[PDB]
Amino acid sequence: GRHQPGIADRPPAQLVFTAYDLTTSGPAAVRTSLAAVLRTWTAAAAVLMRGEPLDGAERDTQGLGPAGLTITIGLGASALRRAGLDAQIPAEFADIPAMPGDQLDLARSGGDLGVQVCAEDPMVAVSASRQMRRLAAQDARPRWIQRGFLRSAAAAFNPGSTPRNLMGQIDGTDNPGPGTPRFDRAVWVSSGPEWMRDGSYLVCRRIRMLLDAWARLDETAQSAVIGRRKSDGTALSAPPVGQGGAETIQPDFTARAADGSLAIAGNAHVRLSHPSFHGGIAMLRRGYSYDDGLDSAGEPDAGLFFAAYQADPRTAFVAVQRTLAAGDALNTFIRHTSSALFAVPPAAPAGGFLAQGLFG
Ligand code: HEM
């Protein structure tokens, strides 16, 4: 209704995220190109998500069903800057500041436009992502492309179980649940410039995991990095499942363990990211595992393509990452190799297009 799909939907097994740069120059020309791409993409994304044949498409999905395809479109602040639309950049749309430990690859970062393609089927996701690319080709070219994955519905004991990441951790437990007032408050913009109300702000970070170093820790040490048991996801301040535990039991940051130590370490990931240290502000983490084989030096390159939605990145992603960068035990085992912020606007009205209000 009011929102773009692909945010509150349960994330399916496959992701293809493409950031694009507008290829013309000059504010008037960039403005025209930006509207043209948004116009074409809004219409095409609807055809594709309905499972209808797109004019000019390739037969790479012939013989397939729609497979939960969602297509979510965001604008980079550079698109508005390049188009001379600076006055319509809301306060929340501020640039993500450089932070200690950053190792951002410029070629994999930023972008005028971002397209999140999700589907349960890998061909469906790659195919739709290439169709969006084809349709924008005269006005925009990919700047970077990330493919990601999560466990499949078919193989899961239950398709609704929280995914594990490549570190073996349950990843998503304290996300707000879709359809709840907590989710709406955390995720959707509800004030400010009209064009972004019922939108959300997306922060992408391609976070490499140092998995060989990770594997040298025993599970006790790995659990202590996060603040939750790796086995069952319970807070280390709470009992494990079977001794009264449940993953909904919130962490208690002053509880003592049986050996008298602070149960959740002062540098535990969950301690430093918890809303109670950040004014109650939560975020929707909708990330995907990635595995890009070997980097240029022959070293493994796999991790988490982090993708968080929030009403205000300043008080969500940025405020939390500032704390993590200063002290998180997890920092030993991860490297942020990219960053991109996108304003993901509300759903277009019938016959309109995404972010059309910028062009009034
Ligand atoms: C590869 C990098 C990362 C890994 C492996 C990781 C892993 C985890 C795990 C295992 C949990 C506990 C279960 C859960 O509630 O989902 C968690 C919670 C959380 N993480 Fe991360 N995370 C990473 C990066 C980040 C970043 C970059 C941010 C924000 C800047 C972040 C923010 C959060 C938040 C807000 C929570 C929930 C806190 C709560 O309410 O309990 N994480 N993460």
Short mmCIF file of C-alpha atoms and ligand atoms in Angstrom, two decimals:
data_model
loop_
_atom_site.label_atom_id
_atom_site.label_comp_id
_atom_site.label_asym_id
_atom_site.label_seq_id
_atom_site.Cartn_x
_atom_site.Cartn_y
_atom_site.Cartn_z
CA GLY A 1 0.00 0.00 0.00
CA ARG A 2 2.10 2.88 1.32
CA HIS A 3 5.53 1.24 1.26
CA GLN A 4 7.83 -0.28 -1.31
CA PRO A 5 8.00 -4.08 -1.05
CA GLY A 6 11.19 -5.83 -0.06
CA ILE A 7 11.53 -4.24 3.38
CA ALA A 8 8.82 -5.65 5.64
CA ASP A 9 8.64 -8.84 3.53
CA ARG A 10 10.51 -11.82 4.97
CA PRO A 11 13.86 -11.86 3.10
CA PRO A 12 14.11 -14.75 0.62
CA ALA A 13 17.17 -16.82 -0.20
CA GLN A 14 18.78 -14.65 -2.90
CA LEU A 15 19.94 -11.03 -3.19
CA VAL A 16 21.39 -9.00 -6.05
CA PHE A 17 22.09 -5.41 -5.03
CA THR A 18 23.23 -2.99 -7.72
CA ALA A 19 24.32 0.60 -7.20
CA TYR A 20 24.15 2.78 -10.33
CA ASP A 21 25.69 6.11 -11.35
CA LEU A 22 23.89 8.51 -13.67
CA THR A 23 26.02 8.91 -16.77
CA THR A 24 25.18 12.43 -17.97
CA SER A 25 26.48 15.69 -16.45
CA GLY A 26 24.98 18.98 -15.35
CA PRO A 27 22.06 19.59 -12.99
CA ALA A 28 19.33 20.07 -15.60
CA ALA A 29 20.45 17.01 -17.59
CA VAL A 30 20.96 14.87 -14.49
CA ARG A 31 17.50 15.90 -13.21
CA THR A 32 15.92 14.77 -16.47
CA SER A 33 17.84 11.47 -16.43
CA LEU A 34 16.98 10.76 -12.79
CA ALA A 35 13.27 11.19 -13.45
CA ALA A 36 13.50 9.11 -16.63
CA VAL A 37 15.13 6.16 -14.85
CA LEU A 38 12.74 6.32 -11.90
CA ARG A 39 9.78 6.47 -14.28
CA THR A 40 10.92 3.46 -16.30
CA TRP A 41 11.99 1.46 -13.26
CA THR A 42 8.76 2.00 -11.35
CA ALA A 43 6.71 0.61 -14.22
CA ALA A 44 9.06 -2.27 -15.01
CA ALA A 45 9.43 -3.33 -11.39
CA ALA A 46 5.64 -3.65 -11.14
CA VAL A 47 5.42 -5.82 -14.27
CA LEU A 48 8.25 -8.03 -13.03
CA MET A 49 6.85 -8.42 -9.53
CA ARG A 50 3.43 -9.39 -10.92
CA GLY A 51 5.17 -12.14 -12.91
CA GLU A 52 4.05 -10.57 -16.22
CA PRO A 53 6.18 -10.59 -19.39
CA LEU A 54 8.41 -7.51 -19.66
CA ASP A 55 8.83 -6.15 -23.18
CA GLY A 56 12.35 -6.84 -24.38
CA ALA A 57 13.20 -9.33 -21.64
CA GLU A 58 15.49 -12.33 -22.00
CA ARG A 59 14.21 -15.91 -21.85
CA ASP A 60 16.49 -16.75 -18.89
CA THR A 61 13.46 -17.33 -16.63
CA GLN A 62 11.28 -19.06 -19.22
CA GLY A 63 9.74 -22.07 -17.50
CA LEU A 64 9.93 -20.51 -14.01
CA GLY A 65 7.41 -19.00 -11.62
CA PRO A 66 7.87 -15.63 -9.86
CA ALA A 67 9.70 -16.99 -6.78
CA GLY A 68 8.88 -14.16 -4.36
CA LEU A 69 10.60 -11.52 -6.48
CA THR A 70 10.79 -8.09 -4.89
CA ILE A 71 12.46 -4.99 -6.31
CA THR A 72 13.25 -2.08 -3.96
CA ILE A 73 14.63 1.22 -5.28
CA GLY A 74 16.55 3.95 -3.45
CA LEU A 75 18.17 7.28 -4.26
CA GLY A 76 21.66 8.28 -3.22
CA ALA A 77 22.24 11.76 -1.86
CA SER A 78 24.63 12.25 -4.79
CA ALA A 79 21.69 11.89 -7.18
CA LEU A 80 19.94 14.85 -5.58
CA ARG A 81 23.19 16.83 -5.37
CA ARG A 82 24.03 16.15 -9.02
CA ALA A 83 20.45 17.09 -10.02
CA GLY A 84 20.53 20.38 -8.13
CA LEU A 85 17.89 19.11 -5.68
CA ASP A 86 19.99 19.84 -2.58
CA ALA A 87 17.15 21.71 -0.87
CA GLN A 88 15.12 18.48 -0.76
CA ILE A 89 17.74 16.41 1.09
CA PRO A 90 16.18 15.90 4.55
CA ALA A 91 18.25 16.15 7.71
CA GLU A 92 18.05 12.35 8.10
CA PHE A 93 19.70 11.92 4.65
CA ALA A 94 23.06 13.22 5.93
CA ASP A 95 26.16 11.44 4.69
CA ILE A 96 27.46 8.48 6.69
CA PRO A 97 30.60 9.80 8.41
CA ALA A 98 33.96 8.11 8.19
CA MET A 99 34.48 5.98 11.24
CA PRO A 100 37.49 4.34 12.90
CA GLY A 101 38.47 1.05 11.34
CA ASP A 102 36.74 1.80 8.03
CA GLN A 103 38.38 0.13 5.02
CA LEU A 104 35.92 1.33 2.41
CA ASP A 105 36.54 0.47 -1.22
CA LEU A 106 35.48 3.61 -3.11
CA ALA A 107 34.54 1.56 -6.19
CA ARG A 108 32.15 -0.54 -4.09
CA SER A 109 30.70 2.40 -2.16
CA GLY A 110 28.05 5.06 -2.61
CA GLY A 111 26.03 5.39 -5.81
CA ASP A 112 23.35 7.71 -7.24
CA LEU A 113 20.76 4.89 -7.27
CA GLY A 114 20.39 1.57 -5.50
CA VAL A 115 18.34 -1.44 -6.60
CA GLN A 116 17.74 -4.31 -4.17
CA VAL A 117 16.52 -7.42 -6.02
CA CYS A 118 15.39 -10.31 -3.82
CA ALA A 119 13.93 -13.66 -4.81
CA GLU A 120 13.89 -17.24 -3.63
CA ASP A 121 15.42 -18.41 -6.93
CA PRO A 122 18.93 -17.32 -8.03
CA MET A 123 18.11 -17.14 -11.75
CA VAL A 124 15.00 -15.05 -11.04
CA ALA A 125 17.04 -12.60 -8.97
CA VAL A 126 19.91 -12.29 -11.45
CA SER A 127 17.46 -12.06 -14.37
CA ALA A 128 15.38 -9.27 -12.88
CA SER A 129 18.51 -7.40 -11.83
CA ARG A 130 19.79 -7.52 -15.40
CA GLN A 131 16.46 -6.29 -16.76
CA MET A 132 16.55 -3.27 -14.48
CA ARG A 133 20.10 -2.65 -15.69
CA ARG A 134 19.11 -2.90 -19.37
CA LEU A 135 16.21 -0.48 -18.96
CA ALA A 136 18.42 2.20 -17.34
CA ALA A 137 21.39 1.75 -19.69
CA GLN A 138 21.12 5.05 -21.57
CA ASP A 139 21.02 7.06 -18.32
CA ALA A 140 22.82 5.00 -15.67
CA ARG A 141 25.46 2.26 -15.37
CA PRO A 142 26.25 -0.09 -12.49
CA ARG A 143 28.89 1.20 -10.09
CA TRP A 144 29.00 -1.96 -7.97
CA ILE A 145 27.10 -5.23 -7.69
CA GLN A 146 26.78 -7.53 -4.67
CA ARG A 147 25.23 -10.99 -4.76
CA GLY A 148 24.16 -12.42 -1.42
CA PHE A 149 22.27 -15.38 -0.02
CA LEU A 150 20.45 -16.78 3.00
CA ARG A 151 19.14 -20.24 3.77
CA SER A 152 16.33 -21.42 1.51
CA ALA A 153 12.72 -21.99 2.51
CA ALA A 154 12.79 -25.50 1.06
CA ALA A 155 15.75 -26.68 3.15
CA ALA A 156 14.77 -24.93 6.37
CA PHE A 157 12.93 -26.96 9.00
CA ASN A 158 10.68 -23.89 8.99
CA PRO A 159 11.01 -21.09 6.41
CA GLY A 160 10.39 -18.52 9.15
CA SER A 161 13.35 -19.45 11.35
CA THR A 162 15.93 -16.74 11.91
CA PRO A 163 18.87 -17.21 9.48
CA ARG A 164 22.34 -18.17 10.60
CA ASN A 165 25.26 -16.18 9.25
CA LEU A 166 28.65 -17.49 8.15
CA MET A 167 29.98 -17.06 11.68
CA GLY A 168 27.39 -19.62 12.76
CA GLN A 169 25.38 -17.05 14.72
CA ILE A 170 21.63 -16.67 14.80
CA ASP A 171 21.31 -13.29 13.08
CA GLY A 172 18.14 -11.20 13.50
CA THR A 173 16.66 -12.13 16.89
CA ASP A 174 16.19 -8.59 18.24
CA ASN A 175 14.96 -7.09 14.97
CA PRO A 176 11.52 -5.52 15.34
CA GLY A 177 8.83 -7.82 14.00
CA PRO A 178 7.02 -6.87 10.79
CA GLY A 179 3.53 -5.49 11.31
CA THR A 180 4.19 -4.15 14.81
CA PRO A 181 4.19 -0.52 15.99
CA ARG A 182 7.81 -1.07 17.08
CA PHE A 183 8.70 -1.93 13.46
CA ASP A 184 6.81 1.04 12.02
CA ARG A 185 8.51 3.40 14.48
CA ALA A 186 11.98 2.00 13.77
CA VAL A 187 11.70 1.67 10.00
CA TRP A 188 9.33 4.20 8.38
CA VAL A 189 9.81 7.97 8.06
CA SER A 190 6.76 9.71 9.54
CA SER A 191 7.72 13.41 9.47
CA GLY A 192 9.69 15.87 7.40
CA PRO A 193 9.71 16.46 3.65
CA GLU A 194 6.70 14.82 2.06
CA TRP A 195 8.60 12.90 -0.62
CA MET A 196 10.26 10.67 1.98
CA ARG A 197 7.34 10.07 4.40
CA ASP A 198 6.44 6.35 4.40
CA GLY A 199 9.93 5.79 2.99
CA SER A 200 12.92 4.38 4.84
CA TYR A 201 16.67 4.99 4.83
CA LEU A 202 18.89 2.05 3.86
CA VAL A 203 22.54 1.69 4.92
CA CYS A 204 24.57 -0.97 3.12
CA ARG A 205 27.93 -2.19 4.43
CA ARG A 206 29.84 -5.05 2.77
CA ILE A 207 31.42 -6.51 5.91
CA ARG A 208 34.13 -9.10 5.33
CA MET A 209 34.41 -11.80 8.00
CA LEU A 210 37.87 -13.09 9.00
CA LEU A 211 36.55 -16.61 9.24
CA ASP A 212 39.89 -18.41 9.64
CA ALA A 213 40.68 -16.29 12.68
CA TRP A 214 37.11 -16.75 13.95
CA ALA A 215 37.42 -20.54 13.73
CA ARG A 216 40.43 -20.55 16.07
CA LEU A 217 38.19 -19.49 19.00
CA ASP A 218 36.21 -22.07 20.91
CA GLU A 219 32.46 -21.54 21.15
CA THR A 220 32.72 -20.08 24.66
CA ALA A 221 35.02 -17.35 23.33
CA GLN A 222 32.92 -16.83 20.20
CA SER A 223 29.76 -16.49 22.29
CA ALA A 224 31.47 -13.91 24.52
CA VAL A 225 32.28 -11.74 21.47
CA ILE A 226 28.55 -11.30 20.75
CA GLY A 227 27.07 -11.62 24.23
CA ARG A 228 24.81 -14.54 23.21
CA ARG A 229 25.32 -18.29 23.13
CA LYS A 230 26.27 -19.50 19.68
CA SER A 231 24.32 -22.72 20.28
CA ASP A 232 20.83 -21.35 20.93
CA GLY A 233 21.05 -17.56 20.62
CA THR A 234 20.22 -16.89 24.28
CA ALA A 235 21.72 -13.94 26.11
CA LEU A 236 24.67 -14.95 28.28
CA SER A 237 22.92 -13.20 31.20
CA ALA A 238 19.98 -15.59 30.82
CA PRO A 239 19.79 -19.40 31.11
CA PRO A 240 20.25 -21.52 27.99
CA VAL A 241 17.29 -23.17 26.33
CA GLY A 242 16.39 -26.21 28.44
CA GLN A 243 17.25 -24.46 31.73
CA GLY A 244 14.47 -21.88 31.37
CA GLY A 245 15.98 -19.91 28.50
CA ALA A 246 14.34 -18.46 25.43
CA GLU A 247 15.80 -16.18 22.81
CA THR A 248 13.14 -13.52 23.53
CA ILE A 249 14.58 -13.01 27.04
CA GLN A 250 16.35 -9.65 26.81
CA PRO A 251 20.02 -9.26 27.78
CA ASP A 252 20.67 -8.03 31.33
CA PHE A 253 23.80 -5.92 31.25
CA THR A 254 24.59 -6.02 34.97
CA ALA A 255 23.95 -9.73 35.61
CA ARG A 256 26.84 -11.83 36.87
CA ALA A 257 27.69 -15.26 35.53
CA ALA A 258 28.08 -18.30 37.79
CA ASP A 259 31.84 -17.66 38.04
CA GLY A 260 31.15 -14.13 39.31
CA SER A 261 32.19 -12.34 36.12
CA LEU A 262 30.03 -9.87 34.23
CA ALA A 263 27.82 -12.18 32.20
CA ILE A 264 27.77 -10.03 29.06
CA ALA A 265 31.19 -8.53 28.42
CA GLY A 266 31.65 -4.78 28.41
CA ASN A 267 32.78 -5.06 24.79
CA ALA A 268 30.10 -7.52 23.64
CA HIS A 269 28.49 -6.71 20.30
CA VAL A 270 24.96 -6.93 21.71
CA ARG A 271 25.85 -4.65 24.64
CA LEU A 272 27.23 -1.93 22.39
CA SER A 273 24.37 -2.11 19.84
CA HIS A 274 21.39 -2.53 22.16
CA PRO A 275 18.67 0.17 21.94
CA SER A 276 18.95 0.87 25.68
CA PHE A 277 22.37 2.43 25.00
CA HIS A 278 21.00 4.46 22.08
CA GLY A 279 17.85 6.17 23.26
CA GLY A 280 15.63 3.19 22.55
CA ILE A 281 16.31 3.46 18.81
CA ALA A 282 16.07 0.20 16.87
CA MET A 283 16.73 -0.72 13.27
CA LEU A 284 15.71 -3.44 10.83
CA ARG A 285 18.75 -5.52 9.86
CA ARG A 286 17.93 -7.20 6.55
CA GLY A 287 21.35 -8.43 5.52
CA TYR A 288 22.57 -11.34 3.42
CA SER A 289 25.56 -13.61 3.66
CA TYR A 290 28.04 -13.24 0.80
CA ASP A 291 30.93 -15.31 -0.51
CA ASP A 292 32.90 -13.74 -3.36
CA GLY A 293 35.59 -16.42 -3.50
CA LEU A 294 39.11 -15.03 -3.33
CA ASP A 295 40.07 -11.36 -3.45
CA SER A 296 42.87 -9.99 -5.63
CA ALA A 297 45.56 -11.33 -3.27
CA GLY A 298 44.20 -14.87 -3.11
CA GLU A 299 42.67 -14.48 0.30
CA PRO A 300 39.11 -15.58 1.12
CA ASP A 301 36.48 -12.84 0.76
CA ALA A 302 33.17 -13.79 2.40
CA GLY A 303 31.06 -12.09 5.02
CA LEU A 304 27.84 -10.22 5.63
CA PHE A 305 26.29 -7.74 3.25
CA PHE A 306 24.76 -5.64 5.99
CA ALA A 307 21.56 -3.84 4.92
CA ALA A 308 19.72 -1.88 7.64
CA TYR A 309 16.49 0.12 7.27
CA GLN A 310 15.65 2.95 9.68
CA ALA A 311 13.69 6.18 9.93
CA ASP A 312 16.87 8.11 10.82
CA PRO A 313 20.39 6.76 10.11
CA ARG A 314 21.87 9.40 12.40
CA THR A 315 20.34 7.81 15.50
CA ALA A 316 20.27 4.21 14.24
CA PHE A 317 23.13 2.99 12.03
CA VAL A 318 25.54 5.85 12.62
CA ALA A 319 25.04 6.14 16.38
CA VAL A 320 25.42 2.37 16.81
CA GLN A 321 28.40 2.01 14.46
CA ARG A 322 30.24 4.85 16.25
CA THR A 323 29.98 2.82 19.46
CA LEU A 324 30.93 -0.45 17.75
CA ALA A 325 33.97 1.10 16.05
CA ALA A 326 35.29 2.31 19.39
CA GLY A 327 35.12 -0.96 21.29
CA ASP A 328 33.29 -3.97 19.84
CA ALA A 329 34.95 -7.34 20.47
CA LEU A 330 33.63 -8.28 17.03
CA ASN A 331 35.97 -5.75 15.38
CA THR A 332 38.85 -8.26 15.55
CA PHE A 333 37.00 -10.50 13.10
CA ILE A 334 35.32 -8.11 10.61
CA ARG A 335 36.26 -5.40 8.10
CA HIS A 336 33.84 -2.87 6.63
CA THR A 337 34.78 -2.81 2.94
CA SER A 338 31.96 -0.62 1.58
CA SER A 339 29.26 1.84 2.61
CA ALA A 340 26.24 3.28 0.84
CA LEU A 341 23.23 5.25 2.06
CA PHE A 342 19.98 5.30 0.04
CA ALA A 343 16.70 7.13 0.57
CA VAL A 344 14.05 4.50 -0.24
CA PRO A 345 10.86 6.47 -1.01
CA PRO A 346 7.22 5.50 -0.40
CA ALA A 347 5.32 3.50 -2.98
CA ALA A 348 4.27 5.48 -6.04
CA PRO A 349 0.57 6.19 -6.59
CA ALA A 350 -1.17 4.54 -9.51
CA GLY A 351 0.30 5.93 -12.72
CA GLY A 352 3.04 7.81 -10.85
CA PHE A 353 6.67 6.96 -10.19
CA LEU A 354 9.02 6.71 -7.24
CA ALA A 355 10.18 10.04 -5.78
CA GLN A 356 8.03 11.92 -8.32
CA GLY A 357 7.55 14.76 -5.79
CA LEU A 358 11.18 15.83 -6.22
CA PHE A 359 10.37 16.98 -9.75
CA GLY A 360 7.51 19.38 -8.92
C1 HEM B 1 29.54 -9.01 10.12
C2 HEM B 1 29.20 -8.05 11.00
C3 HEM B 1 28.11 -8.32 12.07
C4 HEM B 1 27.78 -9.48 12.66
C5 HEM B 1 28.40 -10.88 12.49
C6 HEM B 1 26.69 -9.25 13.58
C7 HEM B 1 26.09 -10.22 14.36
C8 HEM B 1 25.06 -9.97 15.25
C9 HEM B 1 24.45 -10.96 16.11
C10 HEM B 1 24.85 -12.45 16.16
C11 HEM B 1 23.49 -10.36 16.84
C12 HEM B 1 22.61 -11.04 17.92
C13 HEM B 1 21.28 -11.59 17.43
C14 HEM B 1 20.34 -10.51 16.94
O1 HEM B 1 19.69 -9.84 17.78
O2 HEM B 1 20.24 -10.33 15.70
C15 HEM B 1 23.48 -8.96 16.47
C16 HEM B 1 22.63 -8.00 16.99
C17 HEM B 1 22.60 -6.68 16.60
N1 HEM B 1 23.51 -6.07 15.75
FE1 HEM B 1 24.99 -6.99 14.73
N2 HEM B 1 26.36 -7.91 13.50
C18 HEM B 1 27.21 -7.30 12.60
C19 HEM B 1 27.21 -5.97 12.24
C20 HEM B 1 26.41 -5.00 12.79
C21 HEM B 1 26.44 -3.58 12.47
C22 HEM B 1 27.42 -2.95 11.44
C23 HEM B 1 25.47 -2.98 13.20
C24 HEM B 1 25.06 -1.49 13.29
C25 HEM B 1 25.92 -0.49 13.06
C26 HEM B 1 24.83 -3.99 14.00
C27 HEM B 1 23.79 -3.77 14.87
C28 HEM B 1 23.14 -4.73 15.62
C29 HEM B 1 21.96 -4.51 16.42
C30 HEM B 1 21.23 -3.16 16.54
C31 HEM B 1 21.64 -5.67 17.02
C32 HEM B 1 20.45 -5.92 17.96
C33 HEM B 1 20.77 -5.37 19.36
C34 HEM B 1 19.64 -5.75 20.28
O3 HEM B 1 18.57 -5.09 20.25
O4 HEM B 1 19.81 -6.75 21.04
N3 HEM B 1 25.41 -5.21 13.73
N4 HEM B 1 24.44 -8.75 15.48
#
